[PDB]
A paper describes a structure:
Type I [name]-Cas systems employ multi-subunit effector Cascade and helicase-nuclease Cas3 to target and degrade foreign nucleic acids, representing the most abundant RNA-guided adaptive immune systems in prokaryotes. Here, we present two cryo-EM structures of the [name] (Syn) type I-B Cascade, revealing the molecular mechanisms that underlie RNA-directed Cascade assembly, [name] recognition, and local conformational changes of the effector complex upon R-loop formation. The stoichiometry of SynCascade was Cas8b1-Cas7b7-Cas5b1-Cas6b1-Cas11b3. Taken together, these results suggest that both the “GNS” loop of Cas5b and the “GVP” loop of Cas8b are responsible for AYG-[name] recognition in Syn type I-B Cascade.
We also observed a subset of particles within our cryo-EM dataset that formed a partial R-loop state, with only 5 nt of the TS hybridized to the crRNA, alongside duplex DNA bound with Cas8b. This led to the discovery of an additional structure, resolved at 3.8 Å. In our partial R-loop state structure, only 5 nt of the TS hybridizing with the crRNA and 3 nt of the NTS downstream of the [name] were modeled. In contrast to other type I systems, where the NTD of the large subunit displays poor density and cannot be accurately modeled in the partial R-loop state, the Cas8b NTD in the Syn type I-B Cascade structure is well resolved in both full and partial R-loop states. Comparative analysis of the overall structure of Cas8b in the two different states showed that its CTD extended in the full R-loop structure, with an RMSD of 6.7 Å. This extension was accompanied by a significant downward and outward displacement of 11.8 Å, 12.0 Å, 13.7 Å, 6.7 Å, and 9.8 Å in Helix1, Helix2, Helix4, Helix5, and Helix6, respectively. While the position of Helix3 is unchanged. This extension might promote the creation of the ssDNA-binding groove, which is vital for the NTS supporting and Cas3 recruitment. Comparison of the “belly” in the two structures reveals a pivoting motion of the extended Cas8b CTD, accompanied by a correlated motion and rotation of the three Cas11b subunits reflected by an RMSD of 3.15 Å. This motion leads to a reduction in the spatial distance between the belly and the backbone.
Residue numbers in the entry:
A (entry chain A): 11 to 152, 171 to 237
B (entry chain L): 7 to 91, 118 to 373, 379 to 423, 434 to 510, 515 to 547
C (entry chain E): 3 to 301
D (entry chain F): 3 to 201
Write the structure that this text describes.
DNA sequence: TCCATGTTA
DNA sequence: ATAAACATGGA
C-alpha cells in the first residue's frame, strides 16, 4: 500500500441489500460503499448516470483499478430509532392511489430500522500517484478525515476459510453489486482479526471495480 | 428421466439454504424407511439415491416419481375438529417429526403446527398443496402429481432465474421502495421448501397489570451448519432428548422471556448431547451461527419485531446454566439475562439492574409485590447468592441491624420468643411487613446525588470503618442499588 | 465559494415530544447509548417537515399540502414539479414514477431524482435521562353518552424532562445561487423556528436560536465535529476559543467569527483584541443572519 | 397577523395540589428534577379544567359539565347532548370509533380531529422544598351510630411547602371566527383563574 | 394482466 | 382504551 488515512463519524447506517419489510444493519460498511465514497470524495463523477425506472448499469471497461482493505478501532453498539416510512403498494392499488399518479409514493405505513451509535475507520487505499494526487486536490484544491497512517494501528478484517473459528464476525458483506439480474458478489462472510500489527496481505483485496 | 443435482455449502448465500439441505437429506433418510415407499419404488421404478455425502458437498440422483413421493410425504395433511362458542380445520401431518415427538399428546408438535399456520402460511393462497393432500392414504396408493409436473419442468433448467415469492419468510417481492423485483435461482428456490422442518419454535410473552403472562407471536431459531453429516446424525437424538413437562397446554421449557434465550437453550441442548453423543467436534465446529426471528400475526398482515445473529461461545453457556436452578424466577430478577452482554466483558459483575428493574416494577407490581413474594424473589437473588466485597456485606449487615433494632425499640418483642409460642407469628409478621415497606418506599423516591445520603440518618437511627467516603460520595448509584435490593432480603418469607 | 453551515442551541424547557412505541400503559421516548447513559433524540424528518411548514407559512409558493384527513394521514394537493422554480424551494423533490409525463419527451426537464439541498443532521439532547415519571388522570369520557367510552377509565403516566438540544446545518456547495431571495427567506425561517416537533400543543417546546456559531472557508468541515460537548456550560466557548488560540495562524479567525452568547456580556473586548478585528458581531441571531446573508449574496 | 404569549406568576403560600398517589398513610406531591434539586408541578389539565369552570361561571354558552354523582367520576354534557357544533374555545372534542353520529359526515360536516387553539405549558416552582413537613390525625370510628365503620385508627402524614410559582402560555394569531366576544371572555376568565387545585 | 377470498387455548 | 393503515398466483 502507498498510504492510508483515518476518519470518524458519529452516525451512519448500512442497509442489507433488500433486507425486507423491516430493515437491519451491519457493524461495518460494505466494500462497494467505501469504494464509492472514496471515488466521490476525489471529485470523480460517476461514469454512468443514465435515467429510467432504475440506474446503476456499470460496465468495468472504463473504471479505475485499485486494491482496498478495511479496519476497525473501537466496537460500537446499535439502536433502533424510527416508527414510520411509507412504501409503494403491491396489489389492487385501488381508488385514489390510481387517481393521483403524481410520482405516487402513497400509502404511508409504519416501519422501524436501526442506527449505529458511533463509527471510526482507519483504512486507506493502494493506488497510483496520480489518483492520490487528484484525491488530495478534491479534498484540498481548486465529518473529518486526515492521514495518520504510521501510528494508531488497530484490528482488521479478512475473509475466513473453513477453520479457525472466529468471534463476532460480520454475517454478510458486498464486494461489487449492480441493481440488475446477476450473481451479485461471491463471498459473504468476513472475520475480524485483533492484533496491533500491520494487517496481512490477505486483508488487502484487489477490487474489480 | 434421470436428473442429478450437486450442492456445495460454501456457495449458499443464507443459512436458510444450509438448513434446507439438511432438511431434504433427513426427508430422504426418513422416507427410505417405509414399506409403501419401497412398494412404489419397485412398482413405478422410483429413482432416489444420495451419491456423495460428506462435510463439504452433496449429490443426489432422482426421477419424476422420486419428486412425486417427496411431495406426497412432505405435504401430507389431515383435518381436525375444534369447537366454538362447530367447524373443520385442516392440519398438516408434521412429517418425520411425528415419528420423533414422544411427548404426551405431541404437545410440541402442536406448537409447531400452530407456528406453521401463524407465519409460515399467513397468505391462504399458498395453502393449496395441503388442501389437495388431505385424507390421502399413501399406504392405499393415493397419490397426486398435478403440481409436481410444473416443478419438474422448472427444474429441467434450474440455472434460469426466477422471482422470489412469500415462500421466503423474509422480505417481499421487491421490498417496493420502487419497482425492483428480485433475484434468485430455481434450484435455490427449490431448497427452501423443506428447511421449515428443522427450525426451532419458542413462545415469548409480555407481563400485564396483573402479572399474568400474555403470549404474543413466536420466536424462530435457525442454526448454521458447518459439518452436514455430523449435524444430520446428531439432531435425531437432540430432538428426542427434550423435556416433557408441560405448563398448562404448553411445554414448560417452551416459555422464554427474551429472543436470545431460545438461542442459548438450543445450543445448551446441543452441549448436553455432545456429552451424550461423542465422536464429533466442538460446538463451534458444528454450528457457526444462530439466527433468531421474532414474529407475530396481526389481521391480514404479518409484522416482524427483531432479527439478530448470535455466537456459540461456551463461557456464556456456563453462566446461563445457573439461572434454571432457581425455582419460579421472578420476572424482575429474570432481567439478569439482559445484562449478560475490552469494554463489556465484565459488565455483569456490577449488577446495574436497579434502574430498569425498578421502572417496570413501579407501575403494576407495586400493588402485586405483596403477593406470594414472587417465590421469595428467588430468596432475594438467593441472598446475594451466599474491601468492595466487605462494602457489599456491610450493607447487608446494616439493613438487618436496622430492621431488628427498630422493631425491637418499637415494642421490645423478639422473634426468638415469638417462634417459641404459636398463635402469635402473623401478628409479629404484619408489623414487620408494615415497618419494612414504608422504609422501602421512602428510599424508592427522593433519590439524587445529595438528598440520598441524608436518608442514611434513618438507617442508623438507633445509633477503620470510615475510610470509604471516597467511594460513597462518588458512586451514589451502586450503593443505592445495594441498599434498595438488600432491604428486601429482610422482607418476610412466605408461610409455605 | 461555499455555503456556510452552523450549529444551533435551544433554551431549556420541559420536553414535549412523545415518540410513540408505547409499551403497556406508558408512552416513552427513544434513547441512545452514547456513553452508557440515556438521551432523548429527534429525527431530522420532523425538522424538515416543520421548516417546509414555515416556508408555506411565510407565503412562499409550494405545491404540496399535508392536511388532516379523517381516515388516515396522507399528503395531497401536488402536481407535476416540471419547473425547479415555483416548487419545493430547490429541495426534497423526489420522484419514483414508473411511467410519467413522457419521462422527458414532453416534460423536457431533469428527472429530479435523488436530488437534495440542505441535508440536515438530527437533534441530540445534552442531559442524561434520570428515569422520571408523571402520572395521568385519564377519566372515561362518559358513562351515559351515545358515543363510546372504551368501557372503562384508566390511570396513565408519562415522563418529561428539561434539556436543551444542539443542531447542525450541514449546507455546502455553490449551486444554490439561482434564487438568493429563497435562500434568505429559508435562513429567516430557520431563525424563526417554533414548535418544530409534532409532540403536542400543551407543554409545547419551541426551537429558538441561542448562540449559533460556526463558519469555515471553502473547505470540508473539520475541527469541532458539531458534537462532544458539555451541558449548560461554555462548550461553544471553551472548544473553539481554545482551538482558535491554538490555531490563530493555523486557521483564519477573520472569516470564522466569534462564538458563545455569554462572552457577549463579559470579556468581549479582550477576546476581540486578542483574536482579530473581523466581522465578529454578536448581538442577536436575527441581525447576525442578516449580515450572513449580506456577505453571502456576493458569494 | 399578530401573535401573543406571556409568562405569569403569583404570591407565595403553602401548596395546594394533592393527589395521594403514593399510599394511604403518606401523601405526596409530584416532583421534578432541576439542576440536581427538586421542584413542584401543576399539570396543564388542571388549568384547562379551571378555565372550563370559569367559562361556566361567566355566563358563556357551554358544552360540557360533570355530575359528581357516580362511583367513578365521568363527564356527561361533553359527549351526550352535543354533536360538537361549537366547543367552549373551539376545542371541538374528538374520539374515534366505528361511527360517530352517523360517521360525523352527513349530519354535521366536521373533521374527526380538533382545533386546539390554546397553547399552555407545565407550571414549575421557583425554589426547592425538602421532605415531610407536617403531622396529622384521624379518628377511630363513629362508635354508637355505626354507619361509617372505617376502623382505621391511624396517624397519617401530609406534605406541605411554601412557594410561589409561575407558568407561560401562548395564543394563536390569525384565529378570528366568532372571536370578538369569545376570546375576550376567555381572556377575562384567565385574568382571575381562581379555582384551580388538586384539593 | 386483472379478479377470484380466510379464523383460536 | 381504540387506535385502524397486506399477500399469493389464478385465465
Amino acid at each position: 500500500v502507498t498510504r492510508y488515512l483515518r476518519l470518524k463519524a458519529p452516525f451512519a447506517a448500512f442497509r442489507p441489500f433488500q433486507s425486507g419489510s423491516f430493515r437491519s444493519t451491519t457493524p461495518v460498511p460494505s466494500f462497494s460503499a467505501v469504494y464509492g465514497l472514496l471515488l466521490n470524495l476525489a471529485g470523480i463523477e460517476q461514469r454512468q448516470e443514465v435515467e429510467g425506472k432504475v440506474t446503476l448499469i456499470k460496465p468495468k471497461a472504463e473504471l479505475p483499478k485499485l486494491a482496498i482493505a478495511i479496519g476497525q478501532v473501537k466496537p460500537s453498539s446499535t439502536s433502533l430509532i424510527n416508527q414510520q416510512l411509507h412504501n409503494y403498494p403491491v396489489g389492487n392499488s385501488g381508488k385514489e392511489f390510481a387517481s393521483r399518479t403524481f410520482g405516487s409514493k402513497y400509502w404511508i405505513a409504519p416501519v422501524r430500522r436501526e442506527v449505529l451509535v458511533n463509527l471510526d475507520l482507519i483504512i486507506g487505499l493502494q493506488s497510483p500517484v496520480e489518483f492520490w494526487q487528484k484525491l488530495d486536490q478534491g479534498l484540498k484544491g481548486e465529518d473529518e478525515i486526515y492521514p495518520i497512517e504510521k501510528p494508531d494501528l488497530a484490528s482488521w478484517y479478512c475473509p475466513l476459510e473453513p477453520d479457525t473459528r472466529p468471534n463476532q464476525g460480520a454475517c454478510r458483506l458486498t464486494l461489487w453489486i449492480d441493481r440488475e439480474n446477476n450473481t451479485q458478489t461471491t463471498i459473504k462472510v468476513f472475520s475480524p482479526s485483533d492484533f496491533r500489527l500491520e494487517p496481512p496481505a490477505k486483508a488487502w483485496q484487489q477490487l474489480p471495480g | 428421466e434421470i436428473l442429478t443435482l450437486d450442492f456445495n455449502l460454501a456457495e449458499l448465500p443464507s443459512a436458510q439454504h444450509r438448513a434446507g439441505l439438511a432438511g431434504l437429506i433427513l426427508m430422504i433418510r426418513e422416507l427410505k424407511k417405509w414399506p409403501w415407499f419401497k412398494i412404489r419404488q419397485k412398482e413405478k421404478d422410483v429413482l432416489l439415491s444420495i451419491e456423495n455425502l460428506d462435510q463439504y458437498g452433496a449429490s443426489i440422483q432422482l426421477n419424476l416419481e422420486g419428486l412425486i413421493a417427496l411431495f406426497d410425504l412432505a405435504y401430507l395433511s389431515f383435518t381436525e375438529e375444534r369447537k366454538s362458542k362447530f367447524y373443520d380445520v385442516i392440519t398438516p401431518q408434521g412429517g418425520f417429526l411425528a415419528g420423533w415427538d414422544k411427548s404426551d399428546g405431541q404437545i410440541w408438535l402442536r406448537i409447531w403446527r400452530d407456528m406453521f399456520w401463524s407465519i409460515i402460511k399467513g397468505v391462504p393462497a399458498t395453502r393449496n398443496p395441503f388442501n389437495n393432500r388431505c385424507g390421502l392414504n399413501l399406504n392405499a396408493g393415493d397419490s397426486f402429481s398435478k403440481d409436481v409436473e410444473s416443478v419438474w419442468k422448472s427444474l429441467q433448467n434450474a440455472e434460469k432465474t426466477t422471482g422470489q415469492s412469500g415462500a421466503f419468510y423474509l422480505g417481499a417481492m421487491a421490498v417496493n421502495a420502487e419497482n425492483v423485483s428480485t433475484d434468485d435461482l430455481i434450484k435455490w428456490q427449490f431448497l427452501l421448501h423443506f428447511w421449515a422442518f428443522v427450525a426451532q419454535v419458542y413462545c415469548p410473552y409480555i407481563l400485564d397489570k396483573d402479572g399474568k403472562r400474555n403470549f404474543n407471536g413466536y420466536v424462530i431459531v435457525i442454526p448454521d451448519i458447518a459439518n452436514l453429516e455430523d449435524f444430520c446424525d446428531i439432531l435425531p437424538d437432540v430432538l428426542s432428548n427434550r423435556n416433557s413437562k408441560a405448563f398448562g397446554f404448553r411445554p414448560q421449557e417452551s416459555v422464554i422471556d427474551v429472543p436470545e434465550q431460545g438461542a442459548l437453550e438450543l445450543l445448551n441442548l446441543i452441549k448436553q448431547r455432545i456429552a451424550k453423543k461423542a465422536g464429533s467436534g466442538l460446538l463451534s465446529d458444528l454450528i457457526v451461527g444462530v439466527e433468531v426471528i421474532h414474529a407475530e400475526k396481526q389481521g391480514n398482515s404479518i409484522k416482524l419485531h427483531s432479527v439478530s445473529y448470535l455466537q456459540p461461545n461456551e463461557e456464556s453457556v456456563d453462566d446461563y446454566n445457573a439461572i434454571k436452578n432457581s425455582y419460579y424466577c421472578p420476572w424482575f430478577r429474570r432481567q439478569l439475562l439482559l445484562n449478560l452482554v475490552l469494554a463489556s466483558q465484565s459488565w455483569l459483575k456490577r449488577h446495574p439492574w436497579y434502574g430498569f428493574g425498578d421502572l417496570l416494577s413501579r407501575i403494576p407490581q407495586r400493588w402485586l409485590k405483596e403477593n406470594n413474594s414472587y417465590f421469595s424473589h428467588d430468596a432475594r437473588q438467593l441472598f446475594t447468592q451466599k474491601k468492595t466485597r466487605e462494602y457489599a456485606e456491610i450493607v447487608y449487615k446494616i439493613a438487618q441491624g436496622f430492621v431488628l433494632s427498630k422493631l425491637s425499640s418499637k415494642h421490645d418483642l423478639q422473634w426468638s420468643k415469638c417462634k417459641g409460642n404459636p398463635k402469635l407469628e402473623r401478628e409479629y409478621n404484619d408489623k414487620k411487613e408494615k415497618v419494612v415497606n414504608e422504609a422501602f418506599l421512602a428510599i424508592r423516591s427522593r433519590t439524587e446525588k445529595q438528598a440520598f445520603i441524608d436518608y442514611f440518618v434513618s438507617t442508623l437511627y438507633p445509633h477503620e470503618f470510615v475510610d470509604f467516603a471516597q467511594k460513597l460520595f462518588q458512586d451514589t448509584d451502586e450503593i443505592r442499588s445495594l441498599t434498595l435490593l438488600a432491604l428486601s432480603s429482610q422482607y418476610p418469607i412466605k408461610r409455605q | 465559494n461555499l455555503n456556510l453551515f452552523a450549529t444551533i442551541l435551544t433554551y431549556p424547557a420541559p420536553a414535549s415530544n412523545y415518540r410513540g412505541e408505547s409499551e403497556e400503559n406508558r408512552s416513552v421516548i427513544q434513547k441512545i447509548l452514547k456513553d452508557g447513559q440515556k438521551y432523548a433524540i429527534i429525527s431530522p424528518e420532523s425538522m424538515r417537515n416543520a421548516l417546509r411548514e414555515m416556508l408555506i407559512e411565510l407565503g412562499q409558493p409550494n405545491n404540496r399540502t399535508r392536511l388532516h384527513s379523517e381516515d388516515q394521514l396522507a399528503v395531497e394537493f401536488k402536481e407535476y414539479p416540471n419547473p425547479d422554480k415555483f416548487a419545493d424551494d430547490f429541495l426534497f423533490g423526489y420522484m419514483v414514477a414508473q411511467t410519467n409525463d413522457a419521462k422527458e419527451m414532453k416534460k423536457l426537464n431533469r428527472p429530479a431524482k435523488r436530488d437534495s439541498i440542505f441535508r440536515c443532521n438530527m437533534a441530540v439532547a445534552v442531559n442524561p435521562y434520570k428515569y422520571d415519571t408523571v402520572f395521568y388522570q385519564s377519566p372515561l369520557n362518559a358513562g351515559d353518552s351515545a358515543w363510546k367510552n372504551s368501557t372503562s377509565s384508566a390511570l396513565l403516566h408519562r415522563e418529561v424532562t428539561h434539556t436543551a438540544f444542539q443542531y447542525p446545518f450541514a449546507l455546502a456547495g455553490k449551486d444554490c445561487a439561482a434564487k438568493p431571495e429563497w435562500v434568505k427567506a429559508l435562513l429567516q425561517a430557520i431563525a424563526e423556528l417554533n414548535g418544530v416537533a409534532g409532540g403536542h400543543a400543551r407543554a409545547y417546546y419551541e426551537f429558538a436560536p441561542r448562540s449559533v456559531v460556526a463558519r469555515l472557508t471553502p473547505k470540508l468541515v473539520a475541527g469541532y465535529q458539531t458534537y462532544g460537548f458539555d451541558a449548560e456550560g461554555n462548550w461553544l466557548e471553551l472548544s473553539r476559543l481554545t482551538a482558535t488560540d491554538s490555531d490563530n495562524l493555523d486557521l483564519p479567525a477573520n472569516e470564522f467569527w466569534l462564538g458563545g452568547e455569554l462572552v457577549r456580556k463579559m470579556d468581549q473586548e479582550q477576546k476581540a483584541q486578542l483574536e482579530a478585528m473581523g466581522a465578529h458581531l454578536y448581538a442577536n441571531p436575527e441581525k447576525l443572519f442578516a449580515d450572513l446573508a449580506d456577505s453571502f449574496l456576493g458569494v
